[PDB]
Structure formats: structure tokens, C-alpha cells
Ligand binder design. Structure first.
Ligand SMILES: [Mg+2]
Ligand SMILES: [Mg+2]
Ligand SMILES: [Mg+2]
Ligand SMILES: [Mg+2]
Ligand SMILES: [Mg+2]
Ligand SMILES: [Mg+2]
Ligand SMILES: [Mg+2]
Ligand SMILES: [Mg+2]
Ligand SMILES: [Mg+2]
Ligand SMILES: [Mg+2]
Ligand SMILES: [Mg+2]
Ligand SMILES: [Mg+2]
Ligand SMILES: [Mg+2]
Ligand SMILES: [Mg+2]
Ligand SMILES: [Mg+2]
Ligand SMILES: [Mg+2]
Ligand SMILES: [Mg+2]
Ligand SMILES: [Mg+2]
Ligand SMILES: [Mg+2]
Ligand SMILES: [Mg+2]
Ligand SMILES: [Mg+2]
Ligand SMILES: [Mg+2]
Ligand SMILES: [Mg+2]
Ligand SMILES: [Mg+2]
Ligand SMILES: [Mg+2]
Ligand SMILES: [Mg+2]
Ligand SMILES: [Mg+2]
Ligand SMILES: [Mg+2]
Ligand SMILES: [Mg+2]
Ligand SMILES: [Mg+2]
Ligand SMILES: [Mg+2]
Ligand SMILES: [Mg+2]
Ligand SMILES: [Mg+2]
Ligand SMILES: [Mg+2]
Ligand SMILES: [Mg+2]
Ligand SMILES: [Mg+2]
Ligand SMILES: [Mg+2]
Ligand SMILES: [Mg+2]
Ligand SMILES: [Mg+2]
Ligand SMILES: [Mg+2]
Ligand SMILES: [Mg+2]
Ligand SMILES: [Mg+2]
Ligand SMILES: [Mg+2]
Ligand SMILES: [Mg+2]
Ligand SMILES: [Mg+2]
Ligand SMILES: [Mg+2]
Ligand SMILES: [Mg+2]
Ligand SMILES: [Mg+2]
Ligand SMILES: [Mg+2]
Ligand SMILES: [Mg+2]
Ligand SMILES: [Mg+2]
Ligand SMILES: [Mg+2]
Ligand SMILES: [Mg+2]
Ligand SMILES: [Mg+2]
Ligand SMILES: [Mg+2]
Ligand SMILES: [Mg+2]
Ligand SMILES: [Mg+2]
Ligand SMILES: [Mg+2]
Ligand SMILES: [Mg+2]
Ligand SMILES: [Mg+2]
Ligand SMILES: [Mg+2]
Ligand SMILES: [Mg+2]
Ligand SMILES: [Mg+2]
Ligand SMILES: [Mg+2]
Ligand SMILES: [Mg+2]
Ligand SMILES: [Mg+2]
Ligand SMILES: [Mg+2]
Ligand SMILES: [Mg+2]
Ligand SMILES: [Mg+2]
Ligand SMILES: [Mg+2]
Ligand SMILES: [Mg+2]
Ligand SMILES: [Mg+2]
Ligand SMILES: [Mg+2]
Ligand SMILES: [Mg+2]
Ligand SMILES: [Mg+2]
Ligand SMILES: [Mg+2]
Ligand SMILES: [Mg+2]
Ligand SMILES: [Mg+2]
Ligand SMILES: [Mg+2]
Ligand SMILES: [Mg+2]
Ligand SMILES: [Mg+2]
Ligand SMILES: [Mg+2]
Ligand SMILES: [Mg+2]
Ligand SMILES: [Mg+2]
Ligand SMILES: [Mg+2]
Ligand SMILES: [Mg+2]
Ligand SMILES: [Mg+2]
Ligand SMILES: [Mg+2]
Ligand SMILES: [Mg+2]
Ligand SMILES: [Mg+2]
Ligand SMILES: [Mg+2]
Ligand SMILES: [Mg+2]
Ligand SMILES: [Mg+2]
Ligand SMILES: [Mg+2]
Ligand SMILES: [Mg+2]
Ligand SMILES: [Mg+2]
Ligand SMILES: [Mg+2]
Ligand SMILES: [Mg+2]
Ligand SMILES: [Mg+2]
Ligand SMILES: [Zn+2]
Lengths: 155, 78, 98, 127, 24, 117, 60
RNA sequence: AACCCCCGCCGUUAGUUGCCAGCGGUUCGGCCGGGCACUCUAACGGGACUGCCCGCGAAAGCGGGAGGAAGGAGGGGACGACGUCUGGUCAGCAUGGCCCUUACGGCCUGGGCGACACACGUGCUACAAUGCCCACUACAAAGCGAUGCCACCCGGCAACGGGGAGCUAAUCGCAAAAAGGUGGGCCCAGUUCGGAUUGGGGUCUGCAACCCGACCCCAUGAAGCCGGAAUCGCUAGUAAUCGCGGAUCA
RNA sequence: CAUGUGGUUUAAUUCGAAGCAACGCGAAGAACCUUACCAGGCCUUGACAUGCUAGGGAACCCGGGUGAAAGCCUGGGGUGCCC
């Protein structure tokens, strides 16, 4: 990215909810270009969301993903010869991409057999503010403050 | 695996054949290790070429389905 | 009734001979199915550019062998005679059928 | 009397016929919701219709060949769009800015030599 | 996988028809 | 049940059950059921002894297996051993019989890597 | 053993197996395009001089 | 840089490819009558020029917007300066010099280049439930093919063999595309994961498959539960993943 | 597990390529052929080009014995174009 700045790739909305967020989230589930399988596993969980709670999977997804949005992180700025781990803002772009990634990463971490059953639970506990995906969030935020001293390097 | 008529150099057979007539000696030098072991070989002793010299490999009734090559190791460390 | 084949490496020679049969066959004979361009074949040859150890960076050429087809309905003696001593391609190949 | 547009994309092309009717969709025989079973991309290709404010007002007999099922799907949106824009230049004024045109130049890349996949080079090693 | 000589996937990879595949 | 001597396929699909037996695989599995009228999906935990004793005398006779098999296999080698054939000598130094690699790999008959240098 | 083997390949007497390809101009053993009977090398050399009819430098 | 090829969009020319798109016939299969609009085929052109609008600028040109299939080099290939490494190759070939010459030349048989106490590189298959098994059904491209590809029928579980039809190939065949979609089995196990190793039997090419082939079936189910320090590819139809083709060649 | 390379071994395990820019590289087909290596048998104006001298014989075609084959030993038929 030494030249321009790179265009944040655009994305066709959901073939269902019409949500771009869901479109992206699917890609994270997607294994080896098999997009079909990914969507399937997602929607299967989507309905499972209601099967458990009288709530629709819509806001369950937003509520969840919004609780896994890390407010601030630690970037290692190697200035002054040494590599200081400075705490600073998370670009709105990152908060999303990271959340979704952690979401699915923590989801795969779950033990249960079927994959869609993991995306469901992880999604629920996430909106509930309790999931293991949230645990990575609570960490990165604390890891940021455990070094608030060097924050005077915030570029 | 060559099923229809198991190969075996004719001159080699021809050689053992005249030996089956009078039941003579067993002295015999070959160079066709591919040649299959025929039941008429039993009791003989064919010196096979491994690539450097003739190895006096006796041939019992046990060794038959194989070839003369499986008894003249080519690698000098076998 | 007249099914002429027209194959040749150079594509340009095939367009001259294509019109060469359209002029004589039509301007002095019955119906003639226009020049139908058949799907061209291709012989690609990937060769190691160097004479020695140097996989990749190799060059590769190809040998476009063309095809063209034209038909006619009536054996007007005017055409069979004219298109028999006036025709003269070069690297083209002319093979006709009934 | 009818409507026609030529859909194209990725070694796959599609003739589209938007014959006026209720909404009977069918392509290469078989039914829309039959040729594209289990495939979620299906409901997408029919989007150009429900977009122009008229789903239940056109039957849809169509053909398509080459490519893969989804590759055929890409051409469908192109055919359906071109079909109605053909016999109605007013949809162009509001369907063009909404992006339903362009054959989508995205196409397979020619595998270069030395590489593995026109880009994917063989693994490096200094040792 | 593509190494199970005694399955559909296997013979496909190897390019051989064999028993576990249609023929005559 | 103790099918084919001590061998004991138990608590799972009858077809895969007999697989665990030393002389049977996915092949003889489908076939052994189609020679005694047994249902493949049925569990070994729940199936009539009339059906069990059926495979009992069936398999124990239909073909050699277990140690009988494990014995003859030993015999083939002892034969190649005492003959002096190439196929035998490879068994001697434990090298691959299929004359495969040797400069590399071939570990599955050489065991763990020796290193040394 | 470069010339005699050239006379040996064009010989094609014994088993049809023992016969083999051999570049017509240079006389190489390996890399024998059957269509020309040539080796990759000369085949490349000739085409560059167009001495091979209709053959052209591919590029797509 | 540009002039060249491919891919994009539109047109002209052409109808043994395709098409009731239109009708008729129909053993209702584009099969025949028939038709070239259209898919396609392969030649020739149109097209994009910071040409238009706004903003900056002395200019070149830059940023943003419009119309457009395609905007500032649209994407990909071809093309790689004077020279450098006294780089590689005299075992492609040519070529100075040196050297051999009943052998450093020649033919053949057999062996070897395929050794194995190890080390490394490039890779293949995996360690599995986004999974594997089976049955069923669906969509490619590019190519190649007359002592060649095999429609199809008989035999064998099978590789494959006997008999046998079309084609110098947009007309016939290689042909099964796979991932997919549908349905059933599997239940977290060193397992229905994984196919290494080995035993027995068997087929095809070739005089000849011991050394040293390939493929088939039964049995044998190894190491391997995601890999130390370290390290590679890729910025989009890319990487990841699935299958197909050809050169070589019995 | 596949293949290439080091090393090692071997009668031989043919040669080259050597950081990047050698190691699925020359090889886009090592079972004999390929083959450049080793053992043995054997040929030695040569399997390939040109030219001269000398003796017999046409070109040709078939077989015999010996042998792993190469090669070596060797019978029969044939009785051709012009001066
Ligand atoms: Mg900058
Ligand atoms: Mg430091
Ligand atoms: Mg982003
Ligand atoms: Mg080629
Ligand atoms: Mg393409
Ligand atoms: Mg390549
Ligand atoms: Mg690809
Ligand atoms: Mg398995
Ligand atoms: Mg049959
Ligand atoms: Mg084998
Ligand atoms: Mg290795
Ligand atoms: Mg020599
Ligand atoms: Mg050959
Ligand atoms: Mg070769
Ligand atoms: Mg310019
Ligand atoms: Mg096009
Ligand atoms: Mg135009
Ligand atoms: Mg045509
Ligand atoms: Mg009738
Ligand atoms: Mg009828
Ligand atoms: Mg009928
Ligand atoms: Mg019908
Ligand atoms: Mg009717
Ligand atoms: Mg039809
Ligand atoms: Mg017709
Ligand atoms: Mg036309
Ligand atoms: Mg076209
Ligand atoms: Mg013009
Ligand atoms: Mg201007
Ligand atoms: Mg304007
Ligand atoms: Mg103005
Ligand atoms: Mg402005
Ligand atoms: Mg102004
Ligand atoms: Mg201004
Ligand atoms: Mg400005
Ligand atoms: Mg000025
Ligand atoms: Mg602009
Ligand atoms: Mg610009
Ligand atoms: Mg601009
Ligand atoms: Mg450009
Ligand atoms: Mg360059
Ligand atoms: Mg280049
Ligand atoms: Mg200079
Ligand atoms: Mg230099
Ligand atoms: Mg130099
Ligand atoms: Mg120099
Ligand atoms: Mg160097
Ligand atoms: Mg020289
Ligand atoms: Mg030269
Ligand atoms: Mg010289
Ligand atoms: Mg001198
Ligand atoms: Mg000399
Ligand atoms: Mg001499
Ligand atoms: Mg001397
Ligand atoms: Mg020599
Ligand atoms: Mg030899
Ligand atoms: Mg190395
Ligand atoms: Mg490595
Ligand atoms: Mg590999
Ligand atoms: Mg599944
Ligand atoms: Mg699957
Ligand atoms: Mg389908
Ligand atoms: Mg057949
Ligand atoms: Mg039938
Ligand atoms: Mg046809
Ligand atoms: Mg025909
Ligand atoms: Mg046809
Ligand atoms: Mg094929
Ligand atoms: Mg093939
Ligand atoms: Mg097909
Ligand atoms: Mg399936
Ligand atoms: Mg069920
Ligand atoms: Mg279990
Ligand atoms: Mg284990
Ligand atoms: Mg299981
Ligand atoms: Mg075996
Ligand atoms: Mg055979
Ligand atoms: Mg054959
Ligand atoms: Mg084979
Ligand atoms: Mg064990
Ligand atoms: Mg992995
Ligand atoms: Mg590093
Ligand atoms: Mg895989
Ligand atoms: Mg993988
Ligand atoms: Mg082949
Ligand atoms: Mg053959
Ligand atoms: Mg030594
Ligand atoms: Mg070696
Ligand atoms: Mg070595
Ligand atoms: Mg050495
Ligand atoms: Mg070397
Ligand atoms: Mg002589
Ligand atoms: Mg002599
Ligand atoms: Mg002479
Ligand atoms: Mg003789
Ligand atoms: Mg002699
Ligand atoms: Mg004589
Ligand atoms: Mg005589
Ligand atoms: Mg006489
Ligand atoms: Zn050459």
C-alpha cells in the first residue's frame, strides 16, 4: 500500500436479509471458495437462533457482533530503536473485520459437532455478552490499557 | 505378469532338454535372468550372470515360480 | 451438390480463394452457400528457450490450421469448366464433395 | 410482442425471453426452482425483475449454456435486464445507475509458465 | 482420499477406471 | 459375540464390526451379510443368536483368518527367507520388497530415523 | 558414441521396441517432437527463421 | 510508451453450429420439412480522444462527477536497453587447440544410472463432521484422435478380453468433468478418518516386467490428533479449492 | 509417500548444473533400446563420408553349424546392362 491506499472492496448485499454484514460474515465461514456451503451453515444457524429464543436472528447478529467490536488495540510502533506496543484507536473497518473473524474463529473453537450449531451458540453468547469471542475482545482492550503509559506515542 | 505361456529363453530350455534326455551333468552358464524356472530345472545348477560373473545357483524344487534373476543379486552388497 | 473444403495455414490466402470461388460459381451458375468459417484448430508448442538447464522462461509458438466451407446446388457446365483451369491457390487446400 | 436480451458471463451465455404472463419461469426445460435447487445464488438472478417493479407480469422462458451453474446465473441477470430494457428504454434510466449491465469483465486468468496459476509462484528456497 | 485405491475418488485422481467405476 | 475364535466385534454396525476382524474388510463385510441374510445396519449388541451363530459357523469355515492366516503369511516369508530370492533378501534387511526408493524415505520398513553423521 | 547411434536409430531393424525417436537435424535422443521429427532446440531455431510453414510465435 | 495477439462491448459478411425463436409433421429426440432472428463459428470494422462538466495549474497534468459494456495504461500475454556476473552449455549443434586410434573408436549379452547407516530442496496424500462413504441427478473449457480415439452387445466383481458400428473429425469417439444438488449411512473413534507397508491371486504393453513398469481384487490398515527453531506464494475472478486436456510416449 | 540433490556404497552406481540465478534442473518418458558407466564375449579400413590399387565374383536370394547375442565358420540357387 506504499502507493495509493487500496479501495475497500465492495460487496453484494445478502440474498436474504439484504445485509452486507451477513454477506461478509459468510466469507469468513467459507472454506476453499465453497461459498454455497458457507451460506447454508449460516442460515441453518439463523433459524436455530429463533428455535431457541423468540427473537429473530437479525438483531441477534448485530447485538452480538457489536459486543465483539474492540474499542482499542495495541499496535507495536518500532520507533526510538525499540518496539513499543502503543494503545490506540481501532479503525471502524477493523472493528468489523476483526469481530467477524474472532466470531468464527471462536465458533470453530467450540466443541459441538455440527458447524451451524456453533455459529448459533457463539452468536447467542456474543449478543448475551458472554461468548469466547467476547473474551478475545475483553483481552485486546485490557492489553491496550495495561500499556496506557506509552500511549503518548499515539500517531 | 505374463500369464499366457510363461516366458523362458528357448535356447536355455533347449540346453536343459538334452540334459533331461540322458540326465547328464549340471554345468550351465546363462545370461537370461528373466527366464522362468521350469520344473525340469530341479537338481541342476545354472551359473547366472549378475553383471560381473557367473553365480552357481543350485535350483531345488522349492524355487520354481520365480526367475533366474531373483538368485543373482546385481548389487555388490546384497 | 458441390461441397468445397478450404484449409490453409495463412488466413489471408483463404479469403482470396473464398471470394475466388464465390465470383465464378455465382456470377455464372446457380445457388452457392456463402463461405462458412469452420472452427480453427491450434497446435501450440511450448519449448525450452535455452539449449540447457533453464526450465520456464521457455518460449512457445502455435500453428493455426484454418477451415472454410462453401456449397453449391447446380452443376452448371459454365462453372465446372471455369472453376477448373482458372483456379490456382498457393498454400491453400481445395477438396470438394458431392 | 415478446421481450429478449442476451445474457453473457464467463464461458456461459443466455438467451432470455420475457413473454407476458403471470410469472412462469423456466430455462432449458426444467423449472427455475428446480434447476437451481439448494443453490442460494438462484434467487439472485431473478432480482432484475422484482427490481423494476414487476415480478408477476412476465413469464420467463430462457436458455443458457457453457460455464457452471452460477456462471449461467450471472448471464441471467444480464439477459433479463437486457430483455426488458430492449422493449423499454425508460428502465435504462433507472437500471443503469443501479448496475445491471456490463458483461462483468471478470474472467479466468491465463496460467503463465514458471508459475502454477498465472500468479501462484513455486515455493522459494535459498538453502 | 485420493490415495484410497479402492474408492470412487481414488480411481478418478489416478485416471484409471478400474472396478469401482462404470464401464461395460 | 466371539466371532472367529477370540476376535470380538461388538457394539457397532455388524458390517463394520467384522471389519475389526483379522481377515475381513469392507469387501468380505458386505458379502458375509449377503450369505447369511443379515441386516448391515443392525447392531452387534442387539441381534438374534440364530443370526449370530449363523456367522459363527459361517465365517469360521468360509475362509481362513485370525492366526491361521497370520500363520500362513509367516510361512510365505519363511519360504522367501530360506530360498535366497531377491524378495527374501529384502525381507532380511527389512528393505522394501517393491524395489522402491532407498536413498530417501522407505522409513515404514526402516523404522525411526537413525541420523548419525 | 554419437555418430554410430545416429546410424543405429535410422536403422530400425530389431524389435519395434528398440527403435526410437531421434532429431532429424541435430540427432538428439530426448525432446523429440514427432510432428517435425525435430528436437526442441532446432524446432525453435527454424521457426524463428520462419523456415517452418504457418508456424508462428504464440501469444494470447 | 505506441504499432501485434487474447478478453471485454457493437456492427458487417457467412449458414451442415444453433434454433417450433415461427408453423407443420412427430416413433413428440432440433428428428424431418423447413428458417438464419438468435447461441455459436471466424474473418473484417465500429469503439475511448482528459473527448464533456466542476475544481487546481504557467504548462504538463492532478482530484471529483457525468454519459458509457469498457476512463486517465480496462484486464492478461508478446516484447526484456549499454552492460554485469571472465554466469551456464564445446554431453543439442557448430568450432581453434590438446589428446586416442586394432582402442578414449564398434557391436552385442547382462548389470548400473532405480544402491541406502543419513542430510536437503520441490511436491503428493493426509491427520478428518465446512468431514468421509454410497446411490441419484446437474453445469464447463480447451484440446487430441485411421494399423488412432472406441458408440454399443456378450463374458469377468475387476483391470481387461472377444465381437462389433460411426469418423480423414463444429457431423464420430476420448466423455465419466469434479467440487456441487438430492437422499441414506456414519457419531468423535487412531475410527467407515488416514492408505503407507506387506501376503495371495490377476490383467495389459512389450521378444523380455527378478533387478526396474503400470493397473485390478481380496486380505494386511503403518506413521500421522495440524508439525521445533525457521520459512514460502498470493492484492481479485487473485489466493484457496475441484476436475479436464495435451506434449513426451509401445 | 513421490521425485531431484548431498553423502555414502558399488565391478559401475555416466556427465553436467552449485547462494539468489543448482536440487519435478538438461530428461517433454533409464526394464533391453534410451546410454554417454561397469563385467564379459567380440569386431577392428570399421556401423557413417571420399578416393586409389589389386584377386574373385553379378546385383541378388536361401540355409547350415557355433553361440547369451554380436560375431565367427560355411553350403546352395542365381548365370543380369553394353563393347
Ligand atoms: Mg505516498
Ligand atoms: Mg532492536
Ligand atoms: Mg474493511
Ligand atoms: Mg508442446
Ligand atoms: Mg477464459
Ligand atoms: Mg506454467
Ligand atoms: Mg485455477
Ligand atoms: Mg479409507
Ligand atoms: Mg458387464
Ligand atoms: Mg510391480
Ligand atoms: Mg526428501
Ligand atoms: Mg561407447
Ligand atoms: Mg521406445
Ligand atoms: Mg528418452
Ligand atoms: Mg504512445
Ligand atoms: Mg463475447
Ligand atoms: Mg457498431
Ligand atoms: Mg455451420
Ligand atoms: Mg404418424
Ligand atoms: Mg411413427
Ligand atoms: Mg418411446
Ligand atoms: Mg413429449
Ligand atoms: Mg403440436
Ligand atoms: Mg427443444
Ligand atoms: Mg436442414
Ligand atoms: Mg446471419
Ligand atoms: Mg464469438
Ligand atoms: Mg473493411
Ligand atoms: Mg485537454
Ligand atoms: Mg455533465
Ligand atoms: Mg465551459
Ligand atoms: Mg467540482
Ligand atoms: Mg467554469
Ligand atoms: Mg477549475
Ligand atoms: Mg483542484
Ligand atoms: Mg507553454
Ligand atoms: Mg473522474
Ligand atoms: Mg486519474
Ligand atoms: Mg480521475
Ligand atoms: Mg491497458
Ligand atoms: Mg528483463
Ligand atoms: Mg516475461
Ligand atoms: Mg557498448
Ligand atoms: Mg561472464
Ligand atoms: Mg563472459
Ligand atoms: Mg567476456
Ligand atoms: Mg557459478
Ligand atoms: Mg572443439
Ligand atoms: Mg547449430
Ligand atoms: Mg577439428
Ligand atoms: Mg599447433
Ligand atoms: Mg585421426
Ligand atoms: Mg585399427
Ligand atoms: Mg597398439
Ligand atoms: Mg566405447
Ligand atoms: Mg547391454
Ligand atoms: Mg540439497
Ligand atoms: Mg523441502
Ligand atoms: Mg511430488
Ligand atoms: Mg456433508
Ligand atoms: Mg462432500
Ligand atoms: Mg445444476
Ligand atoms: Mg471394447
Ligand atoms: Mg443400453
Ligand atoms: Mg452436427
Ligand atoms: Mg462426416
Ligand atoms: Mg451431431
Ligand atoms: Mg483421453
Ligand atoms: Mg489421454
Ligand atoms: Mg460429456
Ligand atoms: Mg456427493
Ligand atoms: Mg434419515
Ligand atoms: Mg464410535
Ligand atoms: Mg495410529
Ligand atoms: Mg464410524
Ligand atoms: Mg503381490
Ligand atoms: Mg497381457
Ligand atoms: Mg496395443
Ligand atoms: Mg497399462
Ligand atoms: Mg502399531
Ligand atoms: Mg491443515
Ligand atoms: Mg524471515
Ligand atoms: Mg483436499
Ligand atoms: Mg488442502
Ligand atoms: Mg501417455
Ligand atoms: Mg501398440
Ligand atoms: Mg568405494
Ligand atoms: Mg548415481
Ligand atoms: Mg550419487
Ligand atoms: Mg560418486
Ligand atoms: Mg554428477
Ligand atoms: Mg565384417
Ligand atoms: Mg571379418
Ligand atoms: Mg570402403
Ligand atoms: Mg546364417
Ligand atoms: Mg566361429
Ligand atoms: Mg555363402
Ligand atoms: Mg553358388
Ligand atoms: Mg554355382
Ligand atoms: Zn536440432
Amino acid at each position: 500500500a506504499r502507493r495509493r491506499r487500496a479501495e475497500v472492496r465492495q460487496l453484494q448485499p445478502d440474498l436474504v436479509y439484504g445485509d452486507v454484514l451477513v454477506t461478509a460474515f459468510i466469507n469468513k465461514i467459507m472454506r476453499d471458495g465453497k461459498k454455497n456451503l458457507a451460506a447454508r451453515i449460516f442460515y441453518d444457524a439463523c433459524k436455530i437462533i429463533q428455535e431457541k429464543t423468540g427473537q429473530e436472528p437479525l438483531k441477534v447478529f448485530k447485538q452480538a457482533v457489536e459486543n465483539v467490536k474492540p474499542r482499542m488495540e495495541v499496535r507495536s510502533r518500532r520507533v526510538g530503536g525499540a518496539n513499543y506496543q502503543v494503545p490506540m484507536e481501532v479503525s471502524p473497518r477493523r472493528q468489523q473485520s476483526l469481530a467477524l473473524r474472532w466470531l468464527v474463529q471462536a465458533a470453530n473453537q467450540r466443541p459441538e459437532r455440527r458447524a451451524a450449531v456453533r455459529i448459533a451458540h457463539e452468536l447467542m453468547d456474543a449478543a448475551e455478552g458472554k461468548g469466547g469471542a467476547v473474551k478475545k475482545k475483553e483481552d485486546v482492550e485490557r492489553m491496550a490499557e495495561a500499556n496506557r503509559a506509552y500511549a503518548h506515542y499515539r500517531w | 505378469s505374463l500369464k499366457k505361456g510363461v516366458f523362458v529363453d528357448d535356447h536355455l530350455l533347449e540346453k536343459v532338454l538334452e540334459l533331461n534326455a540322458k540326465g547328464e551333468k549340471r554345468l550351465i552358464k546363462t545370461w537370461s535372468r528373466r527366464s522362468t524356472i521350469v520344473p525340469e530345472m530341479v537338481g541342476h545348477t545354472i551359473a547366472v550372470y549378475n553383471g560381473k560373473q557367473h553365480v552357481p545357483v543350485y535350483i531345488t524344487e522349492n524355487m520354481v515360480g520365480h526367475k533366474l534373476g531373483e538368485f543373482a543379486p546385481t548389487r555388490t552388497y546384497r | 451438390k458441390i461441397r468445397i473444403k478450404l484449409r490453409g495455414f495463412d488466413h489471408k490466402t483463404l479469403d482470396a480463394s473464398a471470394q475466388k470461388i464465390v465470383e465464378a460459381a455465382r456470377r455464372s451458375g446457380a445457388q452457392v452457400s456463402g463461405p462458412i468459417p469452420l472452427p480453427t484448430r491450434v497446435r501450440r508448442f511450448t519449448v525450452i528457450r535455452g539449449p540447457f538447464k533453464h526450465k520456464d522462461s521457455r518460449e512457445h509458438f502455435e500453428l493455426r490450421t484454418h477451415n472454410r466451407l462453401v456449397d453449391i446446388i447446380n452443376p452448371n457446365r459454365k462453372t465446372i469448366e471455369q472453376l477448373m483451369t482458372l483456379d490456382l491457390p498457393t498454400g491453400v487446400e481445395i477438396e470438394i464433395k458431392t | 410482442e415478446q421481450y429478449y436480451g442476451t445474457g453473457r458471463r464467463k464461458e456461459a451465455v443466455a438467451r432470455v425471453f420475457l413473454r407476458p404472463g403471470n410469472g412462469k419461469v423456466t430455462v432449458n426445460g426444467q423449472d427455475f426452482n428446480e434447476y437451481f435447487q439448494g443453490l442460494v445464488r438462484a434467487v439472485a438472478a431473478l432480482e432484475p425483475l422484482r427490481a423494476v417493479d414487476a415480478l408477476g407480469r412476465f413469464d420467463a422462458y430462457i436458455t443458457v449454456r457453457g460455464g457452471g451453474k452460477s456462471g449461467q446465473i450471472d448471464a441471467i441477470k444480464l439477459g433479463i435486464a437486457r430483455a426488458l430494457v430492449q422493449y423499454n428504454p425508460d428502465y435504462r434510466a433507472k437500471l443503469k445507475p443501479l448496475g445491471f449491465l456490463t458483461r462483468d469483465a471478470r474472467v479466468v486468468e491465463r496460467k503463465k509458465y514458471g508459475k502454477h496459476k498465472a500468479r501462484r509462484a513455486p515455493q522459494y528456497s535459498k538453502r | 482420499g485420493k490415495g484410497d485405491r479402492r474408492t470412487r475418488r481414488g480411481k478418478i485422481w489416478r485416471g484409471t477406471y478400474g472396478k469401482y467405476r462404470p464401464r461395460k | 459375540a466371539r466371532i472367529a475364535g477370540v476376535e470380538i466385534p461388538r457394539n457397532k454396525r455388524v458390517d463394520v464390526a467384522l471389519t475389526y476382524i483379522y481377515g475381513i474388510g469392507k469387501a468380505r463385510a458386505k458379502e458375509a451379510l449377503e450369505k447369511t441374510g443379515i441386516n448391515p445396519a443392525t447392531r452387534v449388541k442387539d441381534l438374534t443368536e440364530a443370526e449370530v451363530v449363523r456367522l459363527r459357523e459361517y465365517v469360521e469355515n468360509t475362509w481362513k483368518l485370525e492366526g491361521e492366516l497370520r500363520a500362513e503369511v509367516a510361512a510365505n516369508i519363511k519360504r522367501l527367507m530360506d530360498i535366497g530370492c531377491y524378495r527374501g533378501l529384502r525381507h532380511r534387511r527389512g528393505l522394501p520388497v517393491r524395489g522402491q526408493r532407498t536413498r530417501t524415505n522407505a522409513r515404514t520398513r526402516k523404522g525411526p530415523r537413525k541420523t548419525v553423521a | 558414441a554419437r555418430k554410430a547411434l545416429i546410424e543405429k536409430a535410422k536403422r530400425t531393424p530389431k524389435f519395434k521396441v528398440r527403435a526410437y525417436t531421434r532429431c532429424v537435424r541435430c540427432g538428439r535422443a530426448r525432446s523429440v517432437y514427432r510432428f517435425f521429427g525435430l528436437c526442441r532446440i532446432c524446432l525453435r531455431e527454424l521457426a524463428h527463421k520462419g523456415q517452418l510453414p504457418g508456424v508462428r510465435k504464440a501469444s494470447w
